[PDB]
Write a protein that binds this DNA or RNA. Structure first.
Lengths: 136, 78, 94
RNA sequence: UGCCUGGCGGCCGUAGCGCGGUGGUCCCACCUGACCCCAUGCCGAACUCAGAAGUGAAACGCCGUAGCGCCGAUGGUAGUGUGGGGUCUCCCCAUGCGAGAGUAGGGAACUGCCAGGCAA
RNA sequence: GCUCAACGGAUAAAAGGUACUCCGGGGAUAACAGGCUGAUACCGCCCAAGAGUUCAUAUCGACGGCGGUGUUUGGCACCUCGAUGUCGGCUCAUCACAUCCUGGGGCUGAAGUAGGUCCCAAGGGUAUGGCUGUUCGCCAUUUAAAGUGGUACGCGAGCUG
RNA sequence: UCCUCCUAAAGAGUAACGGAGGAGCACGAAGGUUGGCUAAUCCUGGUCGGACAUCAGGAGGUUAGUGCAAUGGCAUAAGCC
RNA sequence: GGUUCUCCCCGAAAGCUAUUUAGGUAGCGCCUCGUGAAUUCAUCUCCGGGGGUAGAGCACUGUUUCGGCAAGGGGGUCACGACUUACCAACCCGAUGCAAACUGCGAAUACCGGAGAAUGUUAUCACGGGAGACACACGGCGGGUGCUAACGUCCGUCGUGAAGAGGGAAACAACCCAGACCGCCAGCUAAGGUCCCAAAGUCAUGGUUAAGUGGGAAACGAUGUGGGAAGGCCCAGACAGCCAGGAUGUUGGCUUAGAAGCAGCCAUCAUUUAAAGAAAGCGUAAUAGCUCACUGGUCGAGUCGGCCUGCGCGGAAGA
């Protein structure tokens, strides 16, 4: 579980997920996992989609994780009425815009990277696609 | 449970009262501000609260001077 | 040996560029040297198959507009965020 | 009228850093001696006095160099005022405004007043 | 000369119980039930690490995700305080199928009997008892089966307490 | 009860049992005027002396300080003597 | 709780501050009447302005990914000194993201002031008389909170209802069009519609749908279908069948028990040749063995695999 270390504040606002993405170009690796749908990824979903992906590309090679959550999400307990303060932090989400590359990979053939990003895309609530590092 | 916040203060009503070319009678407060965000220039005084008060029934005009570019508040004399 | 037929834009902006993008086309521009930047209007379906080659981003292009021939290169390209298509290409007139 | 230099300004990084070169008959700085005017919470290092032997070393001014900083198009994109629509936690259409970042490029400041030196 | 801190300070001076209670009102405001949503609950689906003698997908399926129902626990307080009687029991029932059996089939790690999973199908049937006020739950003995839910957690101008 | 930031939607203002902190003081110098000065944190050398005391030099630039929690401001210094 | 005749004109609010105050009351913001005043005010154009929000970025405060130099650290190794160093790793450097409490940047709107044409029953301000109201609700936009749940709650602006009848969405205050002085068996039109109930096109042209889609619902799956840009192999003969081979020393290494075409490291050689990969699976305790790849004949004209799209199918079970 990717969790931040000593944040400035414990709890922040909800916030909207409007706008476009910034990490569009595949920079570090040769084959990327670019997101198409607009959603968000909790801290368990990155680590779960990493286990089903790293095992298919057997441990030689290298995988870049282009996202980090750094956003707390509160949750009220059961049988608790509204108000009376803010809820307690339970998990950490990463706000994903359309076009954000999620994972990158280099050191594998194009066939092995094709049949491994599909195994990680079934762990994610958002619709992703397969992209390739282009020149310039 | 309980809460520990819920405390603030009487909004101080700061900012600029009289803008650009807008005739001000001497002694008229122009900018009420925390520090010297806007500095006093020609014909305009600065108070003990960094309220730049006019000093000559005239216009206003903001500028940028020196080598720090600090909005500056002068007073054209009409 | 790379020849791209193009035209001259008559309307420019955000609303003029999105009408032109929904018709399988995208705008571009040729600039450089000391002449005026010429607004370039060309088809998307040809150039999308041209940029699959690795020599499209390295060699000298020949864009034909108004009957003339202008030798250019590739400087800056704007990919679409989630679709395999283009939005704008900067051409250095060289 | 030109080249320099010194004092006072506008403008404030196209004006600021780095490297290399150069300037002393003028001016400026370093320097010289300090018992005295003054003064170091010790030291005349600073400040202050009386002078001019030497140097342009350090500082300062000028020139070149883009190696940085900085300025900055045109087009595109995000955003958004008004009126509608949709598979309506978001997006599109008509119209108006239009970034930021980035690219080509520009770029080693310009100038006002007075005094002194020099050539006319 | 006032932590007149309940800080625009009702007095210089002030705590509790009412199931013995009583009056004026409120669904401006809770408890039973209805209504909106579905955090939670139940059920179904997607990838496939593995267990299964080798074999992911006979069977179970981790790490995660997506949905459906309104049966549990919860959220709001929109009707109801010029009265909507409510846990369990008896009598009488009605509907859905997410089917307990009976009926028709696929696969099987199905030799046969006996099984396991899944699909279609609601026509009919679906325990007597000891304990507890009990719905639930434990136990004895049957039975083809002793089903899951909705109807104001059905039913007090039908009975009980 | 009061003060600082955000929510607060680029004039002001703006709610919630919304998210973070403080105050109910102090000072006759910590005020006024005049004069002068620029740190934090590192690197090297040097007696005890070491990661950190004091001394010399370099980079760096206000990342320091502003009596007190925060915001704005401060080199003409409001910082220090 | 009730508050009794009629007509005309104007017309609110459910907000702020205070309150032993929250359902009450006072002032102000809002309403009505009268009086007195300035091209008073509004809309629009131009000019002068202050931002710091949306967006963007990492110069500052933090968070985080990768690569290089790399102190320091680490495990182990020696004889007061230290040799090997699978490892963690501070500051800059190159690249990449995030932030309400970050801003070297920075809108659109909104607000203040000045000049000007037109329009608006002075619509603007001050004073005096009288109030009511201070329980608001929904929809769009920017949000806090809740589960980016609620016909949920709390904010700022606008509209509607309240306090607005009429048409439409079947019925349905708050959704859309549109503001009822009265009368008429007159015409035009907005929202929405034109087969019938029910007034109006069984209207013209070009496509799509086979699902009753239209007339609820996603992840995901699939030779449904239409349109477009390209590619591989091809009448020196393609694509799916039919007929022949589909093997050889490899019991190769491996801990020396066997993995041996199809167990793990593995290289992934090389001949016999028209064709065979020391195998993708089917068999095994390992082999045996069925089999297509890769090659010829037969056959004969097109076939196959990916992308963006429009309408479709399943997932889809309630009393």
């Amino acid at each position: 579980m990717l969790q931040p270390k000593r944040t400035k504040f414990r709890k922040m606002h909800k916030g909207r997920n409007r706008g476009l993405a910034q990490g569009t170009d595949v920079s570090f690796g040769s084959f990327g996992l670019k997101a198409v749908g607009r959603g968000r990824l909790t801290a368990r979903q990155i680590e779960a989609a990493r286990r089903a992906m790293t095992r298919a590309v057997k441990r030689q090679g290298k995988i870049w994780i282009r996202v980090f959550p750094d956003k707390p999400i509160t949750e009220k307990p059961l049988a608790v009425r509204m108000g009376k303060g803010k809820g307690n932090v339970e998990y950490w989400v990463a706000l994903i815009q359309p076009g954000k590359v999620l994972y990158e990979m280099d050191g594998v053939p194009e066939e092995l990277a094709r049949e491994a990003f599909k195994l990680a895309a079934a762990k994610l609530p958002i619709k992703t696609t397969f992209v390739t590092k282009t020149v310039m | 449970g309980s809460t520990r916040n819920g405390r603030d203060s009487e909004a101080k009503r700061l900012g600029v009262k009289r803008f650009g070319g807008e005739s001000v009678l001497a002694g008229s407060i122009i900018v009420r501000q925390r520090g010297t965000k806007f500095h006093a220039g020609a014909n305009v005084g600065c108070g003990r609260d960094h309220t730049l008060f006019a000093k000559a029934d005239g216009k206003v005009k903001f500028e940028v001077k020196g080598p720090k570019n600090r909005k500056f508040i002068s007073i054209e004399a009409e | 040996m790379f020849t791209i037929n193009a035209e001259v834009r008559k309307e420019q902006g955000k609303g003029a560029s999105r009408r032109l993008r929904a018709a399988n086309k995208f705008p571009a521009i040729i600039y450089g040297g000391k002449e005026a930047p010429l607004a370039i209007e060309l088809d998307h379906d040809k150039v999308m198959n041209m940029q699959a080659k690795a020599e499209f981003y390295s060699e000298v292009l020949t864009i034909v507009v108004d009957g003339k021939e202008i030798k250019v290169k590739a400087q800056d390209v704007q990919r679409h965020p989630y679709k395999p298509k283009l939005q704008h290409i900067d051409f250095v007139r060289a």
